Amino acid sequence: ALRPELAFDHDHIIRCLMLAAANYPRLEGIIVQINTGYVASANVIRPVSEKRYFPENLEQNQSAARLVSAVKARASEADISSIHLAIAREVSPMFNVHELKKIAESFEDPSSIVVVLEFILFALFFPTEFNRIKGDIQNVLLLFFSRWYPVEYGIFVQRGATYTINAAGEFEFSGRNEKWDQALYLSEHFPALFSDVP
Amino acid sequence: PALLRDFTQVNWLNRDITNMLQQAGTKYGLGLTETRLDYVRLVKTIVGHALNIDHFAASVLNINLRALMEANVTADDRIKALQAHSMISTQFHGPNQGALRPELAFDHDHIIRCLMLAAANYPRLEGIIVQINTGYVASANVIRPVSE
Amino acid sequence: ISVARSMRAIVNHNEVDRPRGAVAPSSYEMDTGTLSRNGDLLYSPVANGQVGIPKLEVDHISFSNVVSMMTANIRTGDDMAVERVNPDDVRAINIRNA
Amino acid sequence: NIAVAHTDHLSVVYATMSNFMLNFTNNFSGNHATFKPDQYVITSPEGSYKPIIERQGETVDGLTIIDTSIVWPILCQCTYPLVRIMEE
């Protein structure tokens, strides 16, 4: 059945989208809003009032207070906009390189393990956005490794904190320790923690 | 005077100025001229401008700007000072402004020379420095009076 | 006495092409020159393959010069926001090791 | 408790949004070890050079910075249509 309208120009629209992405900052957000809105229309998640962060009694337990203070330090209140966005952004195109909101964690207390888990969850619930901010995560996890597994840490960092990938596909580690910056997200270098090379 | 060319009615003057401006050895201009974008933001930063001005004041202004730009010290470096005045192992974050916010390097040498001179000329300066530290300890809330 | 005389008799004469003793402005008054990479000012080169004479190297006055200046994008001396984050526990803090 | 909601519902929503017309970039190959985004620039001999992805830092759009702690409300204070007992 012949709809009397011009064919949707895939070529012209991908070109104009590339142009917009080069020139119109709002475009990212524009597209994101659509996805955010779609997530909202699907009714996939809603924020309930009752937090379930702790086992019964452990919150009121006196020796648990450090851990509980820590989990309270990481447990942001549920907000539909923030969640819908967090989910929607997993698929939306990214034009300005994303940065991890930085976390200051010395990893002294065992409860500091919370932060590690906070990343693991982020790695699972949102693998893509994770791939974007992963080196900026690696800067935190390296403090955690040097503080929790110092010898293994020394070997790993001796191999190098980063690597490239030659034409063969073999990884090539720097041999050097250096703090990662998202300036590196757009370069040959990769955070070494996710090399998954034994 | 180069602007009088083909505008002054005094013909000998215009003839002379035209002869000078047509010499290979001299060329009048009005800026803007030189332009320098940031390596990342791609926006313009420093720019030349051939002003009508005495060469001396232009030399001095150029010296000032050269000082400020060649230092390679952005505002981010201030964090290093804030660390010195913060409890050990506080961390500061952001916002990574970069080259767009140049600032002079702290003049450690001049300041230390001046400090020596000041302590020598104003021994009471001791009392000011102490006073600063005193207030800081008060802010640290590390010890309080009690009636008991 | 007139050691500061840039110009004299900016006026026409009927009988003669220029009034006697009229003083034209110096060529250096008008050579806008260039900013050397070092930031010293230079007069325009007198010939190809020659660098320009610096304006301070000589005693002539030059009334066009190339002043570099920052644009609205570069800003200096503005105050700067940061997120301080205190140590979690004052007793865990590492006073000692270098 | 919430895993059936993420796998058996939210994943389908990802699968559909994955096809929406304006999700034009490829974002991640599923391989953290190797993946880099493909990188295009508008560019001309006349000197123009506009990267499509660039790192200008935090911006007013409010999308440049990620708070990972969003995971916590998701794992705790958030109900789902699949938990719980019925919900269309």
Binding site: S76, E77, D79, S82, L85, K101 | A75, R78, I79, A81, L82, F92, H93, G94, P95, E103 | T76, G77, D78, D79, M80, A81, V82, E83, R84 | E58, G62, L63, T64, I65, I66, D67, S69, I70, P73
Partner: peptide, 15 residues
């Protein structure tokens, strides 16, 4: 506490 996608600045350094 509340989620905030951006720098949560407090201190203001002087030049």
């Amino acid at each position: 506490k509340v989620i905030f996608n951006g720098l949560d600045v407090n201190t203001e350094v002087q030049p």
